[PDB]
Amino acid sequence: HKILHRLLQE
Amino acid sequence: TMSEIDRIAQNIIKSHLETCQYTMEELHQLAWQTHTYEEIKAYQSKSREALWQQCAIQITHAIQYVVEFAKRITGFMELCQNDQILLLKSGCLEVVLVRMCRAFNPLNNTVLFEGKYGGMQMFKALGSDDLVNEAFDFAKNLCSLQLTEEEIALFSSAVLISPDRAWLLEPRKVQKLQEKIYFALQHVIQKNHLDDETLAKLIAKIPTITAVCNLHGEKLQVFKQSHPDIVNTLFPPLYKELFN
Ligand SMILES: CC(/C=C/C=C(\C)c1cc(C(C)(C)C)cc(C(C)(C)C)c1)=C\C(=O)O
């Protein structure tokens, strides 16, 4: 979930 | 505590206002404008791989806005990160489907796609009329309820904040938040609908929403069989991550 994780924290 | 219920409702309504791909203002300006015959022909002339790529991009765009929607709901961000991820992975497309209804014209059965409204025939190249038909049937049906933006905001948040998703580590915390959301929605509905059963009708559609999204997964799986290279090197990275 690398991308989803990044967006959640963006 | 009624103050908490109102705070939660207002927070969700505000997030919805700020995070739909299409604001009510933009939808109002479009006024159901449809794609021209030339544009429709172009869509029908696209290869299956080409049109799938375009659809994956539009779907990913909408999903990105659902992530933003969740990030602005205070109660959602209070959940452990593991469950935040699970709720988004399992429910982002379901929220997109609910939102799609805002951009659907029930009089001619057209949906907003790449800037203009188009009918199911615009998606012929997908070779998935059943998915299109099921999505359109759901939209037509939800539109018949004539929901307000506040109701769509709250209902979409309940679809996302579902305590029944598999693998959730703290399902009770999700349940408690969803209960508060439904309590708020129950009251909001009183302002716009005579049918005090509207909430019941909405909750009854939950399985249908999941069914449509699972069909999307099924179609994608077959597409991957025929064009594995397209999915791995052409589809949006997030789309691949969520539906592999
Ligand atoms: C405008 C918006 C979301 C729109 C959704 C669209 C265009 C869409 C299109 C299809 C096809 C390509 C098959 C017609 C399928 C689906 C799913 C959800 C059923 C998978 C959604 C969102 C917003 O404004 O926030």
The ligand 1 atom nearest the CA atom of B112? 7
| Closest CA relative to residue B161, chosen from B137, B191, B196, B185 | B185
All structural domains of chain B with their residue ranges: 1-244
Query: Probe ligand 1: pick from B96, B155, B156, B209, max atoms within 8 Å of CB?
Result: B96
The reply to whether residue B241 touches residue A2, judged by beta carbons under 8 angstroms, is yes
For residue B65 and ligand 1, the question of a CB distance below 6 A is answered with yes
| A6 and chain B in contact, CB less than 8 A | no
**Which numbered atom of ligand 1 lies nearest the CA of B93?**
18
Q: Name the helix (H) or strand (E) containing B161.
A: none
What technique was this entry resolved by? X-ray
Calpha distance B135→B113 (Å, rounded): 13
Q: How many CB atoms lie within 10 A of CB B91?
A: 21
End-to-end CA distance of chain A: 14
DSSP B83-147: HHHHHHHHHHHHHHHHHHGGGEETTTTEEEETTEEEEGGGGGGGS-HHHHHHHHHHHHHHHTT--
Helix (H, G, I), strand (E, B) or coil at B34: strand
- Mutation choice for ligand 1 from B32, B35, B59, B129, CB with most ligand atoms inside 8 A: B59
- Residues with Cβ < 8 Å from B229, sequence gap 6 or more? none
**B18 close to B72: Cβ distance less than 8 angstroms:** yes
Cα B81 off chain centre by: 22
CA separation for the pair B34, B30 (Å, rounded): 9
**How many angstroms separate the alpha carbon of residue B97 from the centre of ligand 1?**
6
CA–centroid distance, residue B172 to ligand 1 (Å)? 30
Q: Cβ contacts of residue B66 below 8 Å, gap of 6+?
A: B19, B88, B92, B95, B96, B99, B160
Residue B20 CB contacts under 8 Å (≥ 6 apart), including other chains:
B65, B69, B99, B102
CB B57 within 8 A of CB B231: no
Query: Cα of B23 to ligand 1 centre, how many Å?
Result: 15
Torsion of CA B17, B22, B23, B29, to 10 degrees: -170
- B23-57 in b/e form (b: 16+ CB < 10 A) is eeeeeeebeeebbeeeebeebeebebeebbbebbe
Which CATH fold topology does B1-244 show? Retinoid X Receptor (1.10.565)
